[PDB]
RNA sequence: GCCCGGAUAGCUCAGUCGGUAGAGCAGGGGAUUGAAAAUCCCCGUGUCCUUGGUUCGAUUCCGAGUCCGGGCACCA
RNA sequence: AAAUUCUAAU
RNA sequence: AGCCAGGAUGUUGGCUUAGAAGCAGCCAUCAUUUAAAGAAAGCGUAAUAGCUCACUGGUCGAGUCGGCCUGCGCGGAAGAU
RNA sequence: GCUCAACGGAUAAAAGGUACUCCGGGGAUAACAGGCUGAUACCGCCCAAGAGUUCAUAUCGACGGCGGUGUUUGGCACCUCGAUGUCGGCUCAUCACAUCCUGGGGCUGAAGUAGGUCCCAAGGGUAUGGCUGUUCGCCAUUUAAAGUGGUACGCGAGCUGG
């Protein structure tokens, strides 16, 4: 996990979920390219 | 680093900086960097975003700079007391008004500007918007 | 009882006469060091001819002190001074061949057989 | 490869003025060769040898592919003849002693790179009453890719010690590397010349 | 940081009072010597530190800059 | 009345 | 959007280098069969291979897809009795 | 007839030391501490040329930009000059978390053993000596670890006096 204050999606796999108030992305393909905003 | 050649005076007041701006639309070029907000741009923040939205375009086109910084800023010395003087010329700076357009760009894609003028207005402290030529 | 600054006698032939400890390993802040516990010690003479020169920097373990030791029936065991056998500093193990004067049996462990079997009598 | 200009010095071996004579003629020889190849010889030293020609002359030869060719000059020459210092019809042997140097790049970086400095600030000992006691007037820098400490406690700004203790830092680790690179390359001509004695040589 | 002085031939150095620059050593050619030096004769010197300005004209006059040398940087 | 020097193979 | 099927042909290219073949970097980016298919957008080889996408057919079957201007909110947001 | 240029001109006529000092006043005005600010200091974040064999983001981050705190050096001169005792050491502490150890996790260019980096977490713990008045620092030997700061840069009607 890596919290940043920018959350992006890096590739065609990343997704936008909102958990509890807050906005994080997940990917299938790629472990690297999961993060939460924080 | 754009500066003056020769100047009449070396140094200046420092002003206010009201009102809107004259030279709001797209003279040369076919897309541009229009500002929003209201400030200053030093002349290394011009040159850093100047350096970035060429980079993007690989040598393609033509860019057009379309403001100057003219206005010597001073800055005293470290650890000083008050007065005993002005202060000394550091840098140049180029007052910004809503609605000046800062750069210029002809020969690429319309898709390609866009991106280009992506990553230079990230360089700069004043919040940018991208227009297109206008028939009148 | 032993502490920091304390002279020791050298009860093997490795060629030391006294040392002086310089720091009880084991524990933070720790204050004492009784019969079996290895110390940081340093070398204060020596003879002419030994295995080891003056001013250098040892282990060793403690074999005999006056304060003594005490059994579980209560009883106890006191000598007439402080002695220790030189160690090295890697494999803990002993430099003389031989140990003068008597030991004791919280020496009966596998890393100290080599100081029970040479010693004359154990107490 | 190492085909860049080079740096030609030729001086007096065993003989004293014979071997200066040799020395002149010989590097004659070597302007020649170069004249006729189009390449430019210009004297950067001249240390002459009272009678004729150099006690010791060191010039730069620019061109293409010069240490290519001159690099297999270094060693010692033998000269056997009838000296010009000479009353009677003595034959003479002499020699000369010649090294051949590339050239290189001298980049001098300040690593004054403050991501690798680390910095203290502190008291300074001295007379000064109630105001030296509660301040941080004196600075120290390390420089930690290398090892060197300078400190600075001589005025009563924290400002002004932290600056002139920088340029201290800077100018003693610039002389730490000059040095360095002076003796590599005393060392790299030392074994490149030889001792000129007529008994260790390349050619007669 | 503040104040003061200096920058002239390859090296050490004199000089202007706005139109024009020298000395000793060194350098080149030739004499004397069997030869090298000492000695003798003849011959050349430089964008006067960088920059902007006033002048018909600046080494010189007036502002800035760099380097070098000296003095000062105290009461707590 | 002045005036220094001549390396190293016969 | 799902769910089935296809998703083709001479570049083992000179151009660089030992090896570069769509997917390392220098150019070009044509043509054929076709309903479709890029002389290659992605993952993947020392070099091949191998693995997706575009795009195109069938079921489903009613809506669906992104910019512009605006109101109020979300994160960015750590200090000492 | 005055460069009485200190140019509304004190006499025609004039320089310094005081740590041996003294009087009248001032917080109208400085040194310590408090206050406002945050240039400087320290800590975060945005963009991503690039290095990392290939690969911007495992680990770093050029040119630029946006904030936080109130540990440093400063700017101001608002309180105190009919007095608020100023460094270090000793005894005794208490709080914050921007976490040194122990505790729980995500990514790794994580085989294992050992690591790097980022989240959560303040319950407890968190060296002895040589040199120097030293804070600081270097060195020797240990430890699971030898944390960073606030409290008149804690603490002299509690001790000392280098
Ligand atoms: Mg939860
Ligand atoms: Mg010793
Ligand atoms: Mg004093
Ligand atoms: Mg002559
Ligand atoms: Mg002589
Ligand atoms: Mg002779
Ligand atoms: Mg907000
Ligand atoms: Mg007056
Ligand atoms: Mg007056
Ligand atoms: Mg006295
Ligand atoms: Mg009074
Ligand atoms: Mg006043
Ligand atoms: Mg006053
Ligand atoms: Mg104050
Ligand atoms: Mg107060
Ligand atoms: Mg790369
Ligand atoms: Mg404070
Ligand atoms: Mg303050
Ligand atoms: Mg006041
Ligand atoms: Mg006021
Ligand atoms: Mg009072
Ligand atoms: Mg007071
Ligand atoms: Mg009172
Ligand atoms: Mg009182
Ligand atoms: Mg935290
Ligand atoms: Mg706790
Ligand atoms: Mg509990
Ligand atoms: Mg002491
Ligand atoms: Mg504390
Ligand atoms: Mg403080
Ligand atoms: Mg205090
Ligand atoms: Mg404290
Ligand atoms: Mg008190
Ligand atoms: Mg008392
Ligand atoms: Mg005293
Ligand atoms: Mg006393
Ligand atoms: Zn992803």
Known sequence: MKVRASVKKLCRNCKIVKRDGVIRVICSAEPKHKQRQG | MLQPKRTKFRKMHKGRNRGLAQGTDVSFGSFGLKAVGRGRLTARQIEAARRAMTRAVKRQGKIWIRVFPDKPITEKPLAVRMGKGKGNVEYWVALIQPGKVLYEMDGVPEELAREAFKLAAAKLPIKTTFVTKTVM | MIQEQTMLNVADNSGARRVMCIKVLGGSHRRYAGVGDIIKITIKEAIPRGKVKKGDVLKAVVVRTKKGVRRPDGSVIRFDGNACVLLNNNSEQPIGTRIFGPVTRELRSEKFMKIISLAPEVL | ?204
Not at chain 4, 45 to 61: D, L, P, Q, T, W
Not at chain 4, 80 to 105: D, Y
């Open chain 4, 1 to 204: 490869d190492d085909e860049r200009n080079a740096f030609l010095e030729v001086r007096a071996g065993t003989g004293g003025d014979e071997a200066a004579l040799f020395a002149g003629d010989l590097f004659r020889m070597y302007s020649r060769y170069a004249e006729a190849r189009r390449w430019r010889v210009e004297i950067m030293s001249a240390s002459e040898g009272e009678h004729g020609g150099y006690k010791e002359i060191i010039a730069k030869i620019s061109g293409d592919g010069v240490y290519g060719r001159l690099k297999f000059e270094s060693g010692g020459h033998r000269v056997q003849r009838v000296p010009a210092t000479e009353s009677q019809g003595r034959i003479h042997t002499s020699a000369c002693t010649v090294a051949v140097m590339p050239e290189l790049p001298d980049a001098e970086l300040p690593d004054i790179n403050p991501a690798d400095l680390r910095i203290d600030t502190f008291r300074s000992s001295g007379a000064g009453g109630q105001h030296v006691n509660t301040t941080d007037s004196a600075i120290r820098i390390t420089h930690l890719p290398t090892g060197i400490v300078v400190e600075c406690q001589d005025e009563r700004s924290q400002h002004k010690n932290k600056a002139k203790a920088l340029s201290v830092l800077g100018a003693r680790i610039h002389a730490a590397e000059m040095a360095k690179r002076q003796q590599a390359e005393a060392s790299t001509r030392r074994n490149l010349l030889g001792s000129g004695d007529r008994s260790d040589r390349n050619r007669t």
